[PDB]
A paper describes a structure:
PchD is a stand-alone adenylation enzyme and is part of the initiation module of pyochelin biosynthesis. In the adenylation reaction, salicyl-AMP is formed from salicylate and ATP, releasing pyrophosphate. Next, the thiol of the phosphopantetheinyl (Ppant) prosthetic group of the N-terminal peptidyl carrier protein domain of PchE performs a nucleophilic attack on the carboxyl ester of salicyl-AMP, releasing AMP and transferring the salicyl moiety to the Ppant tether, and priming the first module in the biosynthetic pathway. PchD is comprised of a large N-terminal subdomain (Acore) consisting of residues 1–439 and a smaller C-terminal subdomain (Asub) consisting of residues 441–542 with residue K440 designating the hinge location that allows a range of motion between the two domains.
Using the potent salicyl-AMS inhibitor originally designed by Ferreras et al., the structure of the stand-alone salicylate adenylation domain from Pseudomonas aeruginosa was determined to 2.11 Å. This is the first structure of an adenylation domain bound to the salicyl-AMS inhibitor and serves as an important visual model for making future modifications to continue to develop salicyl-AMS as a therapeutic drug. The co-crystal of PchD and salicyl-AMS diffracted to 2.11 Å resolution and X-ray diffraction data were collected on Stanford Synchrotron Radiation Lightsource beamline 7-1. Analysis of the salicyl-AMS-bound PchD active site revealed that Cys250 is located near to the salicylate ring of salicyl-AMS. The work presented here describes a modification to salicyl-AMS that exploits the presence of an active site cysteine residue near the salicyl ring of the inhibitor. Importantly, both structures were trapped in the catalytically relevant adenylation conformation due to the presence of the inhibitor. PchD overlays very closely with the adenylate-forming conformation of the AB3403 adenylation domain with an rmsd of 2.03 Å over 438 Cα. The Asub of PchD is comprised of a central three stranded β-sheets surrounded by three helices. Regardless of the ligand bound, the two structures are in identical conformation with an rmsd of 0.15 Å over 523 Cα.
Author numbering: 14 to 201, 206 to 540
């Protein structure tokens, strides 16, 4: 667990970025401001700030009685829900660090997380993302992967029930210091990202300012709450610390979510592009009343200008583009930015002390507007992954810059434009091709729902291109789309060598497209 050198600590405290409260103290402060206001809602249950705080304290007492102590680690694998929030904040109070596993994670990942972190417990549910994790949890215990397995819901011994632990008398003490690790986030087997209370609260508080969160923010969880976008950018925690209300959802389909928005008067949410595409193309479901919606954050992957330009007309809300990473840096377009920035950039950095360097293969800083590897250090960017000295020696420069693996350029005013991952690059007979440019043209096509362009081996040109396209009916042929690209003025060498009409793309844990999976499919 590498830390910030002393010069940086001192400057981030002097700047006022790092304050002296833990997550638990911060929620308690917010609760005290508005104790009866509804803080969380699910399909039936609604908790006031004061009821949430008390339940968290009661769960904390129960977890302590069950053996969880300050400095312990747990693997937290729960669907979106009230239990996720309660359990997180109870662990924050106790100084117990949760590994924030995603709903899509399975035994390979879960086992690795328990083992690598030496978790005392796995905390899970009777069901998650269509998966029954209780067999796995039994094997975790049988193999020594963790000591204990708590299940919210029904489960057979040797698994233990989480609900009885809420019956304890409320623990009133906090064991967490602002400089301690609060939780382990996960890289997008995922690496463990040690996030500390004071820096990750800076992340939350400043994001909430930039995104205009306030007492009236009604935040819908469009993504897994474990994920950093959903949790802190500004996320669920930004909503709670602004004294807003969080509306939980275990699904992001526009059918369900549009009705929730109407029911709860949702004002804010966050999505990855593929989900935003579904919301933009939702047909009869758009009969819903979405008048309450004020801000749609889109991030995780680039939202091209063809799609971005449809957000305000179709949904009636402002768009914000978010370039983010669990390791640190967040860039945001700002709520008062002109369209040219919101449609065509992925934001500018959150903190004045975020230090960004775009560098070529040699480590040279590129010229302005030129494309290079994004690297960065700053007041909420880690200095290394948890207990990973050998990987850390490659992933961080000697002066402490995190090497993101993304290819970006910068515009005149500091805004980042993401070309994609280093591994997404296409070189077609020595001509370079920016997938995003071709993807954005195809996505503008009226019978194209989404598109993704990747590299395939070729003996003569080294690489050719293949575009995967989800049609909307009536679906165009590959030949019609090649002609449509031509009529748009796309350079000939950039027209995909191959276009695959398909109903869906493989997806990552939170819904991003897996170009790795596509590129392994081709070869
Ligand atoms: N607007 C964008 N345009 C192009 N690419 C983007 C991108 N936003 C992310 N990426 C890619 O996603 C990696 C990080 O992924 S992440 O840890 O899961 N966390 C997130 O995505 C995340 C998103 C929002 C807020 C907090 C977060 O933590 C990045 O290095 C980069 O490759």
């Amino acid at each position: 667990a590498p830390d910030w050198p002393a010069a940086f600590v001192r400057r981030y405290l002097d700047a006022g970025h790092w304050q002296d409260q833990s997550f638990a103290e911060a929620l308690a402060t917010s609760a005290a401001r508005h104790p009866r206001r509804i803080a969380l809602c699910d399909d039936d249950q609604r908790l006031s700030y004061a009821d949430l705080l008390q339940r968290c304290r009661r769960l904390a007492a129960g977890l302590r009685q069950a053996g969880l102590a300050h400095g312990d680690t747990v693997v937290l694998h729960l669907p979106n829900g009230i239990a996720f929030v309660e359990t997180c904040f109870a662990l924050f109070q106790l100084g117990v660090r949760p590994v924030l596993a995603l709903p899509a994670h399975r035994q390979h990942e879960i086992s690795g997380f328990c083992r690598f972190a030496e978790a005392k417990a796995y905390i899970g549910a009777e069901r998650i993302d269509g998966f029954d994790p209780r067999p796995m949890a039994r094997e975790l215990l049988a193999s020594g992967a963790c000591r204990m397995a708590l299940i919210h819901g029904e489960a057979e011994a040797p698994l233990q029930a989480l609900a009885p632990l809420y019956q304890a008398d409320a623990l009133e003490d906090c064991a967490a210091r602002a400089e301690d690790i609060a939780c382990f986030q996960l890289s997008g087997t995922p690496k463990l990202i040690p996030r500390r209370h004071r820096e990750y609260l800076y992340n939350v508080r400043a994001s909430a300012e930039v995104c205009g969160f306030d007492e009236h923010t009604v935040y819908l969880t469009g993504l897994p709450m474990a994920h950093n976008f959903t949790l802190c950018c500004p996320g669920v925690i930004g909503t709670l610390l602004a004294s807003g209300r969080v509306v939980v959802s275990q699904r992001a389909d526009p059918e369900h979510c549009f009705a929730l928005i109407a029911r709860e008067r949702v004002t804010h949410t966050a999505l990855v592009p593929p989900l935003a595409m579904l919301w933009l193309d939702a047909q009869e479901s758009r009969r819903a009343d979405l008048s309450s919606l004020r801000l749609l954050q889109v991030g995780g992957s680039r939202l091209g200008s063809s799609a971005a330009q449809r957000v305000e007309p179709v949904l009636g809300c402002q768009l914000q583009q978010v370039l983010g990473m669990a390791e640190g840096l967040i860039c945001y377009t700002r709520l008062d930015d002109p369209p040219e920035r919101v449609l065509h950039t992925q934001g500018r950095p959150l903190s004045p002390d975020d230090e960004v360097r775009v560098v070529d293969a040699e480590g040279r800083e590129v010229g302005p507007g030129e494309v290079g590897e994004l690297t960065v250090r700053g007041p909420y960017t880690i200095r290394g992954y948890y207990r990973l000295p050998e990987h850390n020696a490659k992933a961080f420069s000697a002066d402490g810059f995190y090497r993101t693996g993304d290819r970006v350029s910068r515009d005149k005013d500091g805004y980042l434009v993401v070309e994609g991952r280093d591994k997404d690059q296409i070189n077609r007979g020595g001509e370079k091709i920016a997938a995003e440019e071709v993807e954005n043209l195809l996505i503008a096509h009226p019978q194209v729902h989404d598109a993704t362009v990747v590299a395939m081996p070729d003996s003569l040109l080294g690489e050719r291109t293949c575009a995967f396209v989800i049609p909307r009916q009536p679906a165009p042929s590959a030949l019609k789309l090649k002609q449509y690209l031509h009529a748009c003025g796309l350079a000939a060498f950039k027209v995909p060598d191959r276009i695959e009409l398909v109903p869906a793309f493989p997806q990552t844990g939170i819904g991003k497209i897996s170009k790795k999976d596509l590129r392994e499919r081709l070869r």
